[PDB]
Structure 1
């Protein structure tokens, strides 16, 4: 079959979840990944591009262009690290930081959909953390 493949599942369910964020994220005028970078920025006003990649499991290949868009949109600003001219520093603009106020309804909203399943999702999450540690050395 196909629905019996763990990889597929993770793959199609993840793309469906994203479609659920679409109406919400259109509100804030951002994409799901930009949104994920913001969840970081909101807990830490500034971060090296390296740090973001590490936490989101993406690399310069994605972040470089994605951070450019966010910058061109006014949600962030970027500058070279002065203690290490090799890395780049990403910082929230006032807007970027304010935008957090408008995204507080999201988790609960998504949950009002996902938890609509039936079993403890705090279980599924726990699993995925490990799986993630596995698949990530």
Structure 2
């Protein structure tokens, strides 16, 4: 609960950087940024979500989400209709370019990241002491 040293924060930065590195090749191919991909994952699992529902799923506020949604719309991947975000036909087709079930294997693909195990380790060490 309480952080007494910087190790968990350093591990958090490293783990998130490692996640970006893991997906850099694919993101480049799909022409999306990491955050944009997270939004697409949410819609591929459940389409036609309110901006609020998406934000709850990603733990992101409306202010962080709005700019990302505006960029996905500019790419012709989603449509915004009042508060409801829905994939366009091209947004639905994009899923097949990221594999068979991208929204189901996303976090599993990074489960063995050394950086993530180190992060889990730091949390354990905080608990220990």
Moved over 4 A (4+): 105-108
Aligned-pair Cα RMSD in Å: 2.7
What does residue 33 of structure 2 align with?
A: 31
Greater relative CO (CA pairs within 8 A, separation 6+): 2
Shift of 1:116: 6.7
Specify every segment of 5 or more residues in structure 1 that has no aligned partner in the other structure, as ranges: 81-87, 132-137
Give the total of aligned pairs.
Answer: 110
Matched, 1:94 2:89: yes
Unaligned runs of 5+ in 2: 124-129
Normalising by structure 2, what TM-score? 0.73
Cα distance change, pair 4–62 in 1 and its aligned pair in 2 (3 A): closer
Partner of residue 59 from structure 1, selected from 55, 58, 61: 61
Give 1 or 2: higher helix fraction. Answer: 2
